[PDB]
Amino acid sequence: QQCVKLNDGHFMPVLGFGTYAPPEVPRSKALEVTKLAIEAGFRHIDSAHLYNNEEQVGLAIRSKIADGSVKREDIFYTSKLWSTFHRPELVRPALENSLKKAQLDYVDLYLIHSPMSLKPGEELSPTDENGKVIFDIVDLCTTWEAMEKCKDAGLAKSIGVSNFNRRQLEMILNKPGLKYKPVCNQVECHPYFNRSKLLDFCKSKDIVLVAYSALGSQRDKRWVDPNSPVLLEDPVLCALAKKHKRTPALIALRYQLQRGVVVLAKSYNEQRIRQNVQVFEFQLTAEDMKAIDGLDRNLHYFNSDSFASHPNYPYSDEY
Ligand SMILES: NC(=O)c1ccc[n+]([C@@H]2O[C@H](COP(=O)([O-])OP(=O)(O)OC[C@H]3O[C@@H](n4cnc5c(N)ncnc54)[C@H](OP(=O)(O)O)[C@@H]3O)[C@@H](O)[C@H]2O)c1
Ligand SMILES: CCCCC[C@H](O)/C=C/[C@H]1C(=O)C[C@H](O)[C@@H]1C/C=C\CCCC(=O)O
C-alpha cells in the first residue's frame, strides 16, 4: 500500500475499500467481504450511516483485530454524517450512533456526506404529501463547527467533506474563526469525469480529493441510466489493460494514484478484492496518463436530476 499525509498531520492509505452494497445483498456479506478486504491488504475502509452496514463493517474490523491480523491504529475507518443531521445539534449524536453501531471508540475520518441538507429526522429520505424529498436550509459552516467539535472530543481523528464543489469548499475555508480545514473532499471521479479543475483547486489548499465510483459505479438501475457508457468497457482503458497486462479497473485505479487522488474501490468478489490491491504493482507512463485524461465527458453516473433544484446542488458550477 502507501499513505498520504493529511493537512491534519494524520495519514490516509491511498487505497480504500468501498463498502456500499444494494439493499438486495444480505448484510452478512458486508461482514464477510470487509474481512476479505483486510486480509487482502486494504487498510482504509469507507462506510457511512446511509449504507446500513456500519454494524457489519465494525464487526469485521473488530474480528480482524481479535484475529491478531491488525491493530485498531492500522485501520483507517471513515463514516459520514447523513444530510438529515446537518443541524449542528444533531452532529455529535449522529456520530455517536455510528460509533455505537460499529462498536468503535473513534472514527479515523468523519465526513459531511453531501451539502444538500434534508429535513431533520430519523428517516433518511423525507418526502411530503406529493412524494417529493423535503429539503432543509442549514448554514453548513455551523454544521462544520459541530464537526470540529467532534474532532476536539476525539470521536473523529480527521474531518472532511463529500460532494462539495469549489464554492462550497471556499465557504468553509473562508469561515471566520475556522479551526480545522477539511482534510479531503470525496467526490465522484473517474476517466469519464476526472474533476481536474476541482483536483487542482483542492491541491492548492492541501485538501485531498478522494475518488468514488472510480471503477464506473455499480450501475444501480435505480439511479444509473443503463444507457450511460460502461467505464470498464472503454476502448482506451481496455487497450491500456492489454498493454500493461492488467485490467481496466486497475488502469482506472492507477490513473488516480498517479495524479494524486486517493481511490476507493468497491468489490464484494473475493478474487476482484485481491486483484484491486495489485494497483501498487505497476505504473502508467506519462503518455498513458494523457490518453486517459482525454476520456473526460462530464458523465456523472448518479442520476442527480431530481435534486437539481436543491439550493446546494453541487453541479450548478463549472466545478
Ligand atoms: N460519498 C459519496 O457520495 C459516495 C457515493 C458513491 C460511493 N461512495 C463510496 O465509494 C465506493 C465505491 O463507489 P461505487 O460504489 O460506485 O463503486 P465502484 O468502486 O465504482 O464500483 C466498481 C464496481 O466494479 C466491480 N469491480 C470492482 N473491482 C473490479 C475489478 N478488479 N475488475 C472488474 N470489476 C470490478 C464491482 O463489482 P463486484 O462487487 O462484483 O466486484 C463494483 O460494483 C462505495 O462502496 C462507497 O464506499 C461514496
Ligand atoms: C449530486 C451528487 C451528490 C449525491 C450524494 C449522495 O450522498 C449520494 C449517495 C449515495 C451513496 O453514498 C451510496 C448510496 O447508495 C447513495 C445513493 C443515492 C441516493 C440515495 C437517496 C435516498 C436517501 O435519502 O437516502
Side-chain angles (χ1 to χ4, degrees):
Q1 263 246 213
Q2 184 219 324
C3 279
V4 70
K5 185 166 190 235
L6 273 25
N7 60 36
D8 221 4
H10 283 132
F11 290 85
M12 165 187 292
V14 307
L15 212 210
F17 183 63
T19 68
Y20 182 82
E24 289 76 41
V25 336
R27 246 91 277 285
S28 64
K29 304 299 128 82
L31 162 62
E32 141 200 333
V33 311
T34 300
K35 289 201 237 161
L36 293 178
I38 288 160
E39 290 166 12
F42 278 95
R43 287 306 178 259
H44 176 160
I45 299 149
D46 188 87
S47 190
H49 177 243
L50 179 70
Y51 305 169
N52 186 217
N53 73 4
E54 282 186 293
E55 315 83 79
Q56 289 71 226
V57 176
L59 243 177
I61 291 164
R62 174 240 113 169
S63 172
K64 295 306 291 184
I65 284 172
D67 245 324
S69 303
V70 294
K71 292 311 114 224
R72 178 60 184 91
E73 62 253 49
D74 291 339
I75 301 297
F76 188 98
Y77 178 74
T78 106
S79 186
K80 317 178 182 89
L81 171 75
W82 189 229
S83 319
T84 183
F85 305 109
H86 281 184
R87 301 205 174 173
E89 75 268 16
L90 310 175
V91 179
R92 174 151 183 162
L95 176 47
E96 289 173 338
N97 189 53
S98 276
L99 255 19
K100 180 235 105 174
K101 268 174 307 158
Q103 9 131 128
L104 298 175
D105 294 329
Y106 66 93
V107 123
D108 288 86
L109 174 72
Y110 200 45
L111 315 169
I112 286 173
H113 208 145
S114 157
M116 299 185 269
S117 312
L118 260 35
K119 182 211 187 168
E122 250 44 271
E123 157 80 50
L124 264 35
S125 192
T127 73
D128 52 42
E129 314 168 318
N130 272 113
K132 334 183 293 278
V133 180
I134 313 168
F135 299 162
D136 186 22
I137 298 97
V138 181
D139 181 1
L140 293 172
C141 283
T142 66
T143 304
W144 190 249
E145 278 165 355
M147 293 280 293
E148 287 174 325
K149 102 212 165 167
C150 283
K151 172 167 159 73
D152 278 332
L155 305 171
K157 301 290 203 173
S158 279
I159 48 175
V161 301
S162 184
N163 296 300
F164 273 39
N165 57 32
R166 188 207 168 106
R167 173 187 40 92
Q168 281 157 345
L169 277 188
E170 286 171 334
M171 163 197 48
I172 297 306
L173 288 173
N174 291 329
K175 184 182 145 310
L178 174 82
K179 186 167 177 167
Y180 302 121
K181 286 161 63 173
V183 297
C184 69
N185 188 14
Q186 189 185 119
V187 306
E188 175 169 353
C189 185
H190 45 80
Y192 287 168
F193 187 29
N194 73 44
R195 315 276 222 144
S196 54
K197 282 153 165 198
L198 185 53
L199 214 212
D200 282 327
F201 172 70
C202 287
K203 278 194 192 152
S204 85
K205 311 272 155 195
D206 196 20
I207 293 171
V208 170
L209 197 157
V210 181
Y212 70 72
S213 276
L215 283 57
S217 104
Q218 296 187 41
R219 304 186 58 90
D220 194 320
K221 272 31 256 136
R222 270 176 261 115
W223 0 74
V224 180
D225 177 11
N227 282 292
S228 60
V230 185
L231 181 79
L232 298 187
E233 275 182 12
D234 185 82
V236 178
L237 286 190
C238 291
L240 279 164
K242 167 181 126 170
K243 160 201 220 230
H244 286 276
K245 264 132 172 177
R246 299 288 172 170
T247 66
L250 249 4
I251 297 297
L253 286 160
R254 186 77 201 178
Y255 167 64
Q256 305 291 7
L257 290 191
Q258 284 184 218
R259 60 200 297 251
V261 166
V262 167
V263 70
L264 260 26
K266 171 273 184 176
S267 180
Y268 270 46
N269 179 271
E270 232 291 59
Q271 278 214 242
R272 292 198 278 276
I273 285 161
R274 298 183 67 81
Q275 182 197 118
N276 294 348
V277 167
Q278 312 195 105
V279 66
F280 298 99
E281 297 193 338
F282 74 103
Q283 25 43 250
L284 291 166
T285 66
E287 279 319 293
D288 285 335
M289 293 291 290
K290 287 196 309 133
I292 304 171
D293 279 344
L295 263 26
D296 200 325
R297 69 210 42 193
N298 190 225
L299 175 71
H300 320 162
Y301 282 106
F302 174 57
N303 217 4
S304 32
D305 288 359
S306 142
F307 295 80
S309 39
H310 195 297
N312 273 154
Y313 190 66
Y315 296 142
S316 284
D317 304 11
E318 294 163 63
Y319 79 93

